[PDB]
């Protein structure tokens, strides 16, 4: 009963699916996550990838998918919860 | 297996963090910036884990029954269980790639 939004901007080159819902599989007693990585050129957001993410503490106890790093070239996002990567936000931690 | 708690130099899993910034890998690794790789350390006196493999179990069964040369072999702290881990890095053609790389984090340490 765990799944994440799947999106691959490189679907053509990789010859894989472009969208869909990816089921998250992980070892017992190990958490599961969703991830989102995009670009933010002057406000126009361009998603790069979205899908399941393996057990990562950095993603623990986060129902919101937020990027807290300061102005990265490629924004990353990870979170806990079904479709938690459905939406993402930017809130740098200073 | 066991986690290292000092004093006792038995085979235990010592925690260890790898910072991609340190080894100069953050230029091609978007996420994460680092991770807990860990390693194994500790002397092994007379397979000394908690949940081994079929092969280690069969040979261990020959060891605990006196059948040599197993009683003439070294025993050393080595990783027994290894965990995969997700990474978002750059391809050789500067393409953003996400993979579930295997044998990334040492979870259990045992004696060979
Ligand atoms: C990929 O897309 C095809 C066509 O929609 C579908 O049949 C298949 O199950 C999908 N696979 C995954 C892993 O999403
Ligand atoms: C980056 O995207 C977020 C929404 O996810 C937005 O709030 C922010 O303004 C964007 N960055 C810039 C520089 O516009």
Explain what you see.
- The complex is a heterodimer of chains A (94) and B (112).
- Chain A is mainly beta.
- Chain A has one domain.
- Chain A has 1 helix and 7 strands, in the order βαββββββ.
- Chain A is flat, with a radius of gyration of 13 Å.
- In chain B, strands 3-6-7 form a 3-stranded antiparallel β-sheet, with no helix packed on it. A two-stranded antiparallel ribbon of chain B has the order 1-5. A two-stranded antiparallel sheet of chain B has the order 2-4.
- Helix content of chain B is 9%, strand content 40%.
- Chain B has one domain.
- Chain B is mainly beta and 112 residues long.
- The radius of gyration of chain B is 18 Å and the shape is elongated.
- In chain B, strand 6 and strand 7 form a beta hairpin.
- Classes of the chains: A mainly beta (94), B mainly beta (112).
- Chains A and B meet through strand 4 of A and strand 6 and strand 7 of B.
- The site of one 2-acetamido-2-deoxy-beta-D-glucopyranose has 6 residues of chain A, from strand 7.
Content of β-strand of chain B = 35-45%
Q: What is the first-to-last residue Cα distance of chain A?
A: 36 Å
> How many domains is the backbone of chain B divided into?
1
Largest sheet of chain B: 3 strands, antiparallel
Give the proportion of residues in helices of chain B.
under 10%
Strand order of the largest sheet of chain B: 3-6-7
Individual helix count of chain A: 1
Order of helices and strands of chain B: EEEEEHEE
Bound molecules: 2-acetamido-2-deoxy-beta-D-glucopyranose
Largest interface: A-B, 18 and 13 residues
* Helix content class of chain A: under 10%
The side-by-side strand order for the widest beta sheet of chain A comes to: 2-1-4-3-6
How far apart the termini of chain B lie comes to 13 Å
Helix-and-strand structural type of chain A? mainly beta
Shape of chain B: elongated
- Structural class of the secondary elements of chain B? mainly beta
Strand fraction of chain A equals: 35-45%
How many β-strand stretches of chain B? 7
| Rough outline of chain A | flat
Protein name (chain B): Inhibin beta A chain
Subcellular location (chain B): Secreted
Family (chain B): Belongs to the TGF-beta family.
Disulfide bonds (chain B): 4-12, 11-77, 40-109, 44-111
